[PDB]
Amino acid sequence: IRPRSATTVTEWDYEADVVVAGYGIAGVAASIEAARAGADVLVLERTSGWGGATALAGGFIYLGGGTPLQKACGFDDSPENMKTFMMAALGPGADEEKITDYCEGSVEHYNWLVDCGVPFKESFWGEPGWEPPFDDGLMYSGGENAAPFNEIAAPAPRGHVPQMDGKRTGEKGGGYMLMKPLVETAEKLGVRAEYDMRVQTLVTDDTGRVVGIVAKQYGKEVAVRARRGVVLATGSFAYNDKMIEAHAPRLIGRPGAAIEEHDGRSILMAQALGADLAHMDATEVAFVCDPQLIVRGILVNGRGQRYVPEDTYSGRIGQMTLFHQDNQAFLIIDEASYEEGAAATTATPFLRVQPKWAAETVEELESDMGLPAGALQSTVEVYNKHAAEGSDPLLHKKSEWVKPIGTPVAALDLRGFTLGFTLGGLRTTVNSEVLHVSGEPIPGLFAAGRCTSGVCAGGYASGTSLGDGSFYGRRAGISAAKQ
Amino acid sequence: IRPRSATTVTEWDYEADVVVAGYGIAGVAASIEAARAGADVLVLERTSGWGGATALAGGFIYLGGGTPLQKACGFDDSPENMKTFMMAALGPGADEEKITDYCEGSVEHYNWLVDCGVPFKESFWGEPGWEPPFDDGLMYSGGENAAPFNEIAAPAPRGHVPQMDGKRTGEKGGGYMLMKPLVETAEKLGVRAEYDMRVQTLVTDDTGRVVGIVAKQYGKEVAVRARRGVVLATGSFAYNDKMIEAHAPRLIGRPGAAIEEHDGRSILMAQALGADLAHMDATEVAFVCDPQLIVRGILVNGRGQRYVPEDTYSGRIGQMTLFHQDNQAFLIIDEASYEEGAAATTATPFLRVQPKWAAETVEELESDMGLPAGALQSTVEVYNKHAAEGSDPLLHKKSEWVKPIGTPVAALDLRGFTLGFTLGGLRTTVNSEVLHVSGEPIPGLFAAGRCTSGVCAGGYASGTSLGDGSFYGRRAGISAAKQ
Numbered sequence: 001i002r003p004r005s006a007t008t009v010t011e012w013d014y015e016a017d018v019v020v021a022g023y024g025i026a027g028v029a030a031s032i033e034a035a036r037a038g039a040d041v042l043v044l045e046r047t048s049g050w051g052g053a054t055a056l057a058g059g060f061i062y063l064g065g066g067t068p069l070q071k072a073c074g075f076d077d078s079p080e081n082m083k084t085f086m087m088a089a090l091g092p093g094a095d096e097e098k099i100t101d102y103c104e105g106s107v108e109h110y111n112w113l114v115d116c117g118v119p120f121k122e123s124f125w126g127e128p129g130w131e132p133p134f135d136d137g138l139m140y141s142g143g144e145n146a147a148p149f150n151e152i153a154a155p156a157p158r159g160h161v162p163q164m165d166g167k168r169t170g171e172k173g174g175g176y177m178l179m180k181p182l183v184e185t186a187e188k189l190g191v192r193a194e195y196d197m198r199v200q201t202l203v204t205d206d207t208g209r210v211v212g213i214v215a216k217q218y219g220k221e222v223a224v225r226a227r228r229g230v231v232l233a234t235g236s237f238a239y240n241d242k243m244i245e246a247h248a249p250r251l252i253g254r255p256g257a258a259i260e261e262h263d264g265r266s267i268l269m270a271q272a273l274g275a276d277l278a279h280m281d282a283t284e285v286a287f288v289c290d291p292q293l294i295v296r297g298i299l300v301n302g303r304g305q306r307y308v309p310e311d312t313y314s315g316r317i318g319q320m321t322l323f324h325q326d327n328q329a330f331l332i333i334d335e336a337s338y339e340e341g342a343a344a345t346t347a348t349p350f351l352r353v354q355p356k357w358a359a360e361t362v363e364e365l366e367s368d369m370g371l372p373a374g375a376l377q378s379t380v381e382v383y384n385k386h387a388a389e390g391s392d393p394l395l396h397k398k399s400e401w402v403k404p405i406g407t408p409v410a411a412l413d414l415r416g417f418t419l420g421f422t423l424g425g426l427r428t429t430v431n432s433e434v435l436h437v438s439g440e441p442i443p444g445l446f447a448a449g450r451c452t453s454g455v456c457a458g459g460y461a462s463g464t465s466l467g468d469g470s471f472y473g474r475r476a477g478i479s480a481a482k483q
Numbered sequence: 484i485r486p487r488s489a490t491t492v493t494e495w496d497y498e499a500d501v502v503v504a505g506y507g508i509a510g511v512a513a514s515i516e517a518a519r520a521g522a523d524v525l526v527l528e529r530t531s532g533w534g535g536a537t538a539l540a541g542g543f544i545y546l547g548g549g550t551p552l553q554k555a556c557g558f559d560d561s562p563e564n565m566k567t568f569m570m571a572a573l574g575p576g577a578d579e580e581k582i583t584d585y586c587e588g589s590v591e592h593y594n595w596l597v598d599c600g601v602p603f604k605e606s607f608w609g610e611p612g613w614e615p616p617f618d619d620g621l622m623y624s625g626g627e628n629a630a631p632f633n634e635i636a637a638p639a640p641r642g643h644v645p646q647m648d649g650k651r652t653g654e655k656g657g658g659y660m661l662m663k664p665l666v667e668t669a670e671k672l673g674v675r676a677e678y679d680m681r682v683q684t685l686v687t688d689d690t691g692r693v694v695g696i697v698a699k700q701y702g703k704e705v706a707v708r709a710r711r712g713v714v715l716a717t718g719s720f721a722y723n724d725k726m727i728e729a730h731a732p733r734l735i736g737r738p739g740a741a742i743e744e745h746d747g748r749s750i751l752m753a754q755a756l757g758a759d760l761a762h763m764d765a766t767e768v769a770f771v772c773d774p775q776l777i778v779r780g781i782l783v784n785g786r787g788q789r790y791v792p793e794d795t796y797s798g799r800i801g802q803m804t805l806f807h808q809d810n811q812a813f814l815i816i817d818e819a820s821y822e823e824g825a826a827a828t829t830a831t832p833f834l835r836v837q838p839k840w841a842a843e844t845v846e847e848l849e850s851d852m853g854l855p856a857g858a859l860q861s862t863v864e865v866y867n868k869h870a871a872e873g874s875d876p877l878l879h880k881k882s883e884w885v886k887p888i889g890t891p892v893a894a895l896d897l898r899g900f901t902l903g904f905t906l907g908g909l910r911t912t913v914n915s916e917v918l919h920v921s922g923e924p925i926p927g928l929f930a931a932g933r934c935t936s937g938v939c940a941g942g943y944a945s946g947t948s949l950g951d952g953s954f955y956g957r958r959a960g961i962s963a964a965k966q
C-alpha cells in the first residue's frame with residue numbers, strides 16, 4: 001500500500017494523460033470530461049466490465065434548483081432551497097462549501113446528463129415507496145415533504161430517475177440507464193479501458209506528485225503512467241471488515257452495499273500519502289419493509305413508543321431505527337389499513353412483510369408482543385386522541401396519513417430490518433483534488449464517488465451517491481486533464 | 484505537517500534515546516518505563532509546566548479484575564468479567580485485543596501505580612454522583628451496576644481515585660495526585676524535560692523511520708533527535724474546529740475538553756506518514772445536572788417519553804440524550820423527591836439545577852411544558868402503575884430508586900445540557916506502536932493517550948482515559964526504549 005517510487009519502475013505497461021481507476025459513475029463522468037478537454041484517457045477496471053454498483057442501483061440522481069424535469073412536473077425549487085434542505089438533512093457537520101457548489105451547479109448538471117443521452121420521463125410519482133414502480137422520472141427521495149424538513153425548506157422532489165423499463169435493483173437497475181449513455185459518450189470520445197485491472201498502489205516521484213499506479217492484471221504486476229493525473233473512482237469501503245469495525249461499526253453484520261470490490265483500497269492508497277478523511281462513520285441505512293404499509297400504521301420502538309413520522313423517507317426511518325432505537329421496531333397497523341397498504345402500488349411488493357401478531361384489542365397485542373402493561377396501550381390511546389382530529393403533534397406525520405388505529409390490530413416484527421453502506425472517505429475539494437492533512441492538494445491525485453466524502457456527512461437521501469459521484473466525477477476529469 | 488527529511492537537518496538542538504511529546508499522563512508513564520529500561524529520555528512540553536488535562540481531571544482510573552482496592556472494599560471482579568463489561572459498554576466495534584490486554588494487565592497496573600507513589604484510600608463511595616465527595620478510592624464509574632450492563636456482566640466498581648483533599652475538577656482535580664507521584668518518579672530516574680516546546684512535524688530518514696521531531700521553542704525552530712523512538716502523547720483533537728466538523732460533528736458548539744493544546748497536531752503529523760485512525764466519531768458526553776436529583780425522578784425526551792434508566796452512569800445519560808434524543812431532556816420529579824435529592828451528598832452541588840416549571844398535577848405540568856395532551860400524562864401513568872410494585876419493566880432502573888411520582892410535580896429543563904471531548908485517534912498496537920494503513924508499525928513511532936484510539940470505541944466510562952493513557956503510556960515507553 002506504501003507508494004512506489006517512480007525511479008524504481010523499470011517499464012510502463014500502459015501510459016495515458018488521465019488514468020481513471022474504476023469504471024462506475026464517478027469514473028465514467030471523469031473520463032468524459034477529461035476526453036472532452038483533449039486528454040488521452042485510460043480507465044482501469046477491476047472486473048471484466050463497466051458499471052460497478054452504479055449499474056445495479058435504483059437510478060435516483062439527487063438534483064434540483066429548478067431542473068426542466070421539476071418544472072415540467074410543476075415543482076418550484078432553487079439552489080438556495082435545495083442547499084437549506086441538504087444542510088439540515090445530510091449532516092450534522094455537512095460540508096457547506098461542497099453542498100453549496102453542488103446546488104448551484106445542479107440544473108447545469110441535469111442538462112449535462114441529458115446532453116450525454118440520459119433519458120428522463122417528465123412525470124412524477126407521488127406515492128410512498130423506495131422507487132417509482134413505473135418509468136417516471138421524478139420522486140421525493142429524501143424526506144423533503146415530511147417532518148422535520150418540510151418546515152425548514154420548501155418541499156421539492158429531487159429524485160431524478162432515468163427512463164427505463166423492467167428495472168431490477170441489484171441486477172440491472174435504473175442506474176444502468178445512467179451508465180449506458182455515459183459509456184457510449186466516453187467511447188465515442190476515444191476513452192480507452194483495460195479490464196481485470198486491480199489497482200494496488202500509487203506511484204510518486206521525488207516531489208511527492210502522483211505520476212501513475214501499480215496494478216495486478218491477468219495475473220501479473222503492471223505499471224500504468226499518468227502524465228497529468230490519477231482519478232480514484234473505485235468505490236467505498238463497505239466490504240472491508242477491518243475498516244467497518246474501525247470506522248463504521250454500526251454496519252457490523254448488516255452489509256447492504258452492492259458489490260464486493262468496494263474494499264476501501266483507494267482510500268488506503270491515498271492515506272499512505274497523507275490524504276485526509278472525513279465522516280468515516282457516515283452510513284446509508286435501508287429498512288426492508290414496504291413504505292405503503294409503513295405509512296398506514298405507527299412505528300414503535302422496543303418500549304412501545306413512537307419515534308419517527310411514518311411518512312418520511314424510509315432511509316431516514318432506517319437510520320432512526322438503527323442509530324437511535326437499538327435496531328428495534330414494530331409496525332402497529334389495523335387490519336383494514338394493512339389490507340389497503342398491501343394492495344397499494346409499489347416497486348417492492350417483495351417487501352410486504354406479513355404481521356407476526358394479530359389481536360382483537362391493543363391490550364392483547366401488547367401482551368402478545370411481550371411489552372409491559374400500558375406501554376403500547378398508552379401510545380395508541382394518545383395517538384388516537386389526536387388522530388381523531390387529523391393531528392400528529394408528537395411527530396408531525398402529515399394529516400393525510402393520520403387517523404385513529406382501529407381493530408382488529410396487527411404488529412409486524414421489524415427488529416433487525418436494517419442494512420447499509422458507507423458514505424465516508426477521502427476529503428476532496430470542489431474540484432475533486434484529494435486533500436493532504438496539510439490542507440493542500442496532493443499533486444496529480446483526484447477522486448470522486450464513494451471513495452470520497454461527498455455531499456452526505458451523516459443523513460442520507462436517495463440519489464446523492466449517483467448525484468455527487470457524477471457531479472464530482474466531472475470535476476475530477478476536468479482537474480486531472482489540466483496541464 | 485509533511486515529514487522533514489533527516490538529511491535536511493543541519494544541526495540537532497537536542498538529542499535523546501526516547502523523545503516524548505507531551506507531559507500529561509501518557510507522556511509521564513512512557514518516560515518512567517523508558518528511563519527504567521536505561522534509555523536517555525527527553526519530554527517536550529508545549530506549555531510552561533507538566534500536567535496537561537490530566538492534572539485537571541477528577542482522577543478516575545478505570546481498573547479492575549481484582550485489585551487490592553476492590554478486595555479491601557469487598558467487590559469481586561476478574562479480567563474476564565471486566566472484559567465482558569467493557570466490550571458491551573464501550574463499543575460498538577470495540578478493539579477486543581486491546582480491551583483483553585488492558586483487562587489482563589489491570590491488577591499489575593494498579594500495583595505499578597501504587598509502587599510509583601499514587602495513594603488510594605481503601606474505601607468505597609456508593610451514592611450516585613460524578614465523583615467521590617470525599618477522599619474515597621473506589622466508585623462505580625461506567626454504569627456497571629445499572630441496566631443493561633448489570634445483566635451482561637457482574638457489577639463491579641472500577642473507578643479507582645487517588646487520595647486527595649480539596650479536589651477541584653478543572654483547576655487541580657484528583658488527577659493531580661495521579662500526575663505528581665509519577666512526575667516525582669520520572670525526575671528521580673533522570674527524565675529530562677524541555678518546556679515551551681510546540682512539536683510541529685516528524686523527521687524521517689530515507690527508510691521512513693521516525694528519527695526525531697521539529698518544534699517551535701522560545702520563538703525559534705528547533706530539531707530534536709530521537710535515537711530509539713518518538714512517543715506522541717500530546718492529547719486529543721477536541722479544540723481543532725476543522726477536525727471536529729469532519730470527524731465528530733456532534734460536538735460542534737459543545738466543547739467539554741479541559742485544555743486548548745488539544746489541537747490534533749500529533750494525529751495529523753502521524754497521518755502525514757500514512758498512519759491509520761480509528762473511531763474518530765467517538766465522544767465522551769457529560770450531562771451537567773447532579774446525579775442525586777436525576778436518580779430520584781424520570782428523564783423524558785422532547786416527546787415526553789422515558790429513554791434511559793435514571794440510575795445509570797450520568798455520562799451514559801449524556802450520550803443517550805445527545806446522540807438519540809436530539810439533545811432534548813427534562814427531569815420530571817415530585818417536590819419531596821427534589822428536596823431529598825437536593826439535600827443528598829454530592830461532589831457537584833453547583834449542578835443542582837432548579838426546576839423551571841412546577842404544578843399541582845401532571846396534566847398542568849404537561850401543558851406548561853408545551854407537550855401535547857397525554858404525552859407526559861401517559862408516561863407518568865404507566866411508570867406509576869409499575870412503580871407502585873417497585874418495578875421499572877421499560878428501562879430497568881433498580882428497584883431501590885423506583886416509586887411512583889407524586890404531587891406537586893416539577894420539571895427541570897435539561898435541553899442543551901451536554902458537552903464532550905473526543906476519544907478517536909491514531910490506531911496503535913498493544914505495544915503502542917503507531918500503525919500504518921498497511922497494518923505494519925511505522926518504525927520509530929509510538930503513541931498513547933488521547934492522540935490514540937484507546938479502550939473506548941463509542942461508549943465511555945469515567946477513568947478509561949487516565950487508565951488507558953497510563954497503561955499504554957507504559958507500553959509506549961517500553962517499546963520506544965528497545966534497541
Ligand SMILES: Cc1cc2nc3c(=O)[nH]c(=O)nc-3n(C[C@H](O)[C@H](O)[C@H](O)COP(=O)(O)OP(=O)(O)OC[C@H]3O[C@@H](n4cnc5c(N)ncnc54)[C@H](O)[C@@H]3O)c2cc1C
Binds near residue numbers: 449
Ligand atoms: C440496492 C442499492 C440501490 C442503490 N441505488 C442507488 C440510487 O438509486 N441512487 C444513488 O445515489 N445511490 C444508490 N445506491 C448506491 C450507489 O449504487 C453507489 O453508492 C454508487 O454506485 C457508487 O459509485 P462509485 O462510482 O463510487 O462506485 P461504482 O459504481 O461501484 O464503481 C467503482 C468501480 O471501481 C471498480 N474497482 C474497485 N476496486 C478497484 C480496484 N482496486 N482497481 C480498479 N477498479 C476497482 C469496481 O469494480 C467498480 O466497477 C444504491 C445502493 C444499493 C445497495
Ligand SMILES: Cc1cc2nc3c(=O)[nH]c(=O)nc-3n(C[C@H](O)[C@H](O)[C@H](O)COP(=O)(O)OP(=O)(O)OC[C@H]3O[C@@H](n4cnc5c(N)ncnc54)[C@H](O)[C@@H]3O)c2cc1C
Binds near residue numbers: 536945
Ligand atoms: C472535566 C473533566 C474531567 C475529567 N476527568 C477524568 C477522569 O477523572 N478520568 C479519566 O479517565 N478522564 C478524565 N477526563 C479526561 C482526561 O482528563 C483526558 O482525556 C486525559 O488527561 C488526556 O491524557 P493525555 O496524556 O492524552 O493528554 P494530557 O494530559 O492533556 O497531556 C498532553 C500534553 O501534551 C501537551 N501538548 C499538546 N500539544 C503539544 C505539542 N504540539 N507539542 C508538545 N506538547 C503538546 C499538552 O500541553 C499537555 O501537557 C476528564 C476530562 C474533563 C474535561
Ligand SMILES: C[C@]12CCC(=O)C=C1CC[C@@H]1[C@@H]2CC[C@]2(C)C(=O)CC[C@@H]12
Binds near residue numbers: 131284464
Ligand atoms: C434506499 C436504496 C439505496 C440507496 C439509494 O440511493 C436508493 C435506494 C432505492 C432502492 C432501495 C435501496 C436500499 C435497499 C432497498 C430498500 C431494497 O431492498 C429494495 C429497494 C431498495
Ligand SMILES: C[C@]12CCC(=O)C=C1CC[C@@H]1[C@@H]2CC[C@]2(C)C(=O)CC[C@@H]12
Binds near residue numbers: 945
Ligand atoms: C464525566 C467527567 C469527565 C470524564 C471522566 O472520566 C470523569 C468525569 C468526572 C467529573 C465530571 C466530568 C465531566 C464534566 C462534569 C460533569 C462537571 O461539569 C462536574 C463534574 C464533571
Ligand SMILES: [Cl-]
Binds near residue numbers: 256421
Ligand atoms: Cl453500493
Ligand SMILES: [Cl-]
Binds near residue numbers: 536739740741742904
Ligand atoms: Cl480533556
